[PDB]
Subunit: 200 residues, 6 copies
């Protein structure tokens, strides 16, 4: 039975916000890592092996596929998850080490509202900023639909060449799904901030 020194750590860190701010923030565990690990990875399996362009010329397929996709979507969502997860991790590390230093303190000098809310709201605004920045980068690069026919105009390919993607509809549905989950996570992060700021 060694689940006590960790039970108090979570009750101290979860005492700030509303309980709805924690019991609705499980979508980072059930809707993000699970969906990226299980289903949507296999849809991007045969990416380059099924891309085909209508040309006799050798080597045009590689440069046209490069111009179509600067960076595939699954690595993009992995970078989004990594760059969003980090402030919560450093916040938990700082809070746990401050708690451990004070737990060492009262047994080393007492044998005879603070900066935590500031760090908390800093982490929340950083999460919001990174989420809206990644959403704007995706809206600028790709849009939220994929056409089955792409027109390629790159060297050393002759004038205009047509290329056909692999499985566009399923990728469209999954792009829309990740967009909806990201927007819901954004609104959920701003709602608890409004709740805490109107509590004080």
């Amino acid at each position: 039975g060694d689940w006590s020194a960790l039970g108090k750590l979570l009750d101290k860190v979860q005492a700030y916000s509303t309980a709805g701010g924690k019991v609705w923030l499980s979508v980072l565990f059930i809707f993000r890592i699970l969906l990226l690990g299980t289903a949507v990875e296999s849809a991007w399996g045969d990416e380059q092996s099924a891309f085909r362009c209508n040309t006799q010329q050798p080597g045009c397929e590689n440069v046209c596929y490069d111009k179509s996709f600067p960076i595939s979507h699954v690595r993009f969502w992995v970078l989004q998850i990594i760059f969003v997860s980090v402030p919560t991790l450093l916040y938990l590390a700082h809070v746990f080490y401050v708690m451990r230093k004070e737990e060492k303190l009262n047994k080393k000098e007492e044998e005879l509202r603070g900066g935590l809310l500031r760090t908390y709201i800093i982490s929340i605004l950083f999460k919001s900023i990174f989420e809206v920045a990644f959403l704007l980068i995706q809206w600028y690069i790709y849009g939220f639909s994929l056409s089955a026919v792409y027109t390629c105009k790159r060297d050393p390919c002759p004038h205009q060449v047509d290329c056909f993607l692999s499985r566009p509809t399923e990728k469209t549905i999954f792009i829309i799904f990740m967009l909806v989950v990201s927007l819901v996570s954004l609104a959920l992060n701003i709602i608890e901030l409004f709740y805490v700021f109107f509590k004080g």
Copy 2:
């Protein structure tokens, strides 16, 4: 020995319905995740690599396969499992945190039928609604049989083109099996609701 603080949590949450409502609801653990993970995933392995259409034209295979399958069945059942699992998870989280708050309560202020049934029946009706919605979407999109010959009439393919699927009979049997398991889960969810409503 640390299996006591979790033994009471399950006896409190399982005290509402009949024991048959729990000991028959193991099919989410034995018939859904096991069957999707072990057997039926390997049947959808060589999906695009064995699809073939009878045409000399380049790139017609991709668009005809896209028009045949907007979304493959295994990702559809994964989305069904995820969208059905979530209400039970949030119900357990809310009940455990209410129990933890009241366990903190009686040691913080006593040293000197409720909303749970409402949340329970809300979760059960949400499970039923999502199950019948997914079944109706599958009945509208695909039907419950697969033909070996498909007729494709999409650009830029010439007039009419024939395509042959890969392994239709085994996929037909597994579609029928998942349909039967979904219907049995639906009837099982409504039976305990009738039992609880006629208990009170």
Copy 3:
């Protein structure tokens, strides 16, 4: 040390039959899941990628392979294992919850031969019925040998076409092995039933 509340559960459930009924029923753990997971799965690896028919016509290979194999053997044995495992699991769940209810009972009202054999023999006869039904379905569908040459007579293939399977001898040996293990499991299940019925 938390292996006491589980040690009594197994001694209560194993008290009914002979000890030989349990120490010989480990073949579901050593001969079924191990053999299907380790060796015989890799033999059915290159199933469709090595099937070949002797025709110039496109798309005849898929329909002839479909007519040869309605459902491959490894998914069939997986369905057999799943449909045989379930009565033991529900029997253990019912017995454990009855034991837990009575363990709660004698501490809630005593502070101041039964239905189990019926459920047991019901589970045993269900196991026997499912085993002999799966064996008869396999004897009706495939037989217990495989020829290297198959004659295919399906549309849109011309008149008669010959196809050659991949690795028939190893699959024949493994089919014979699973048949022998299934028959031994059947006789082993009926022997303990005779022993218990002649005990009483």
Copy 4:
């Protein structure tokens, strides 16, 4: 700390033979499962995909490869390991359940050289019989060398056809290695039997 109820079980079962009979019988754990799992499995990876015969005729490759290899060596060694491991497992199960019944006994009726050596020598002679039977079957089927050129004379291939195997030298070395390990295990099993029989 729950490693006491298992420490006595091993001291009781290891009290019969010499300590060298146990500390040298770790080759079933370090030399058999490790070597089959790690190194020698990858050598039989591209078995059928690199087999090639010198003929224009379609479908001759499959039947000539079938006639060359009735059953590949890795599944053969897996069957050898499984059919050798089982007597030790049933011996441990019987000894542990007899020990548990007698541990229940002296607390249920005493509150106010035997059959084990027979079962032990039966298990040892069964291990020896199965080892020498598998070695004789391998000596009858394959021999202990592989030629790079095979002559195939099977229907419907024309008269005589030549086929070339993939990587024969590495497979020869591993066949010789498994033969040496099997012979050493045989001599090691018979030495402890002689030691125990000359002890009594």
Copy 5:
């Protein structure tokens, strides 16, 4: 509960530097092993299978790809992680064994600033030296950009041959990312060294 004999070991080793030197040195766990294991490995999947040069001559592709890539980037970053991780590991091993010897000491002879900072700064300067050496080797070998067209002038290829790489943009982005993480790790390692040297 066995997390005490390890809790003191970490408080002794983390007592030297600032807490920011440890809570910011988690990037070896969250940004290095995770990113190399999950995302960037799959980008270097189809390396040789998509490399193509524009020549009729057999075997020119292998030597031109060899001259383009002496060693691929993922094995290079793996060697960097391994050669950077080792001084911290030997430092922890030496400190733990010195602590264990002194813990044995005061119970064996007392029943009736030191070399650690030197070893610490030695490990830190070794980490800095290896990081800047690997960065200079990568700047000398490859540069920090990749062109889609490579000119190959090696035997036995005729005069000048052109080759096209696979997915250059995504690899460029990941090269820039690993460069930024390495520079940040370098500055972070030198900052705590300045902090400790100006503390004393």
Copy 6:
């Protein structure tokens, strides 16, 4: 808390040699199994699928690749690790069982420098002999460099045939690295032997 009966076993076995003999012998755990499992395995992935010889004749590629590589390097290093690891394992097993027999002894008969150094130096000299034997076998078979062009003169290939290997430079670097690690392990094993022999 069950890490005491194992803490004394390691302090008894590590009491013989210097602490540097143990804290520097972690390279079997950090530099051998990790490097073989993670990086260098993927370099030998596409071995046979990229080997190509310049001939129109069928089946010459297999015999020329066989004559080039009698046994690939990764299985060779796996055999080296297995044949080096075993003396330490049997030494630990013998020491632990002697310690367990004497721990049973003083509680069974006392209720009212030795052979260990000989076994230790035997294990060390066996490790040295096996290391230098494997290094001499590798120096005799392959040398420590690989040429991109191989000349093959085997039946039934016509007179002289040229073959081109896949990725020779990276394999050269990894061969040199494993050679350096093996030589460092050899010198490290002989240094502690000199230290112990000059201690006594």
